[PDB]
Design a protein around this ligand. Structure first.
Ligand code: ZN
Lengths: 22, 101
């Protein structure tokens, strides 16, 4: 599950980050 | 061998500290008003010339990113990073970095 924990944290950074499609 | 969340967070902290040192350094150079290094919680954006589209390799310390890709900002002609109007956000395109997530 360590892969999921890490990736799900990255999800938050990207959501809060990648803004060109807003 | 797996990279833990805790290691990934450490690597972000290390990149953030490097970004702070970088900003302090370039601020001591001769300059006009380029867009300045900024930490966004993923990347340290480098100096940008007024007007230019700034491309950064998707960072190698983010284990899950597409390292063959680039992320993009734009420096405006006044030397300010381009914004997303109506949202409290700087414009940044990370689509290439996340295309296989
Ligand atoms: Zn969550």
């Amino acid at each position: 599950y360590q892969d999921l924990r890490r990736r799900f944290f990255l999800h938050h950074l990207i959501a809060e980050x990648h803004t060109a499609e807003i | 061998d797996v990279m833990t969340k805790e290691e990934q967070i450490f690597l972000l902290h290390r990149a953030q500290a490097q970004c702070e040192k970088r900003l302090k350094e370039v601020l001591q150079r001769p300059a006009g008003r380029p867009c300045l290094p900024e930490w966004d919680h993923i990347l340290c954006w480098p100096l940008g010339a007024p007007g230019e589209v700034v491309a950064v390799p998707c960072p190698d310390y983010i284990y899950d990113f597409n390292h063959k890709g680039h992320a993009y900002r734009r420096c405006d002609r006044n030397g300010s990073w381009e914004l997303v109007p109506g949202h409290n956000r700087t414009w940044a395109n990370y689509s290439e970095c996340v295309k296989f997530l």
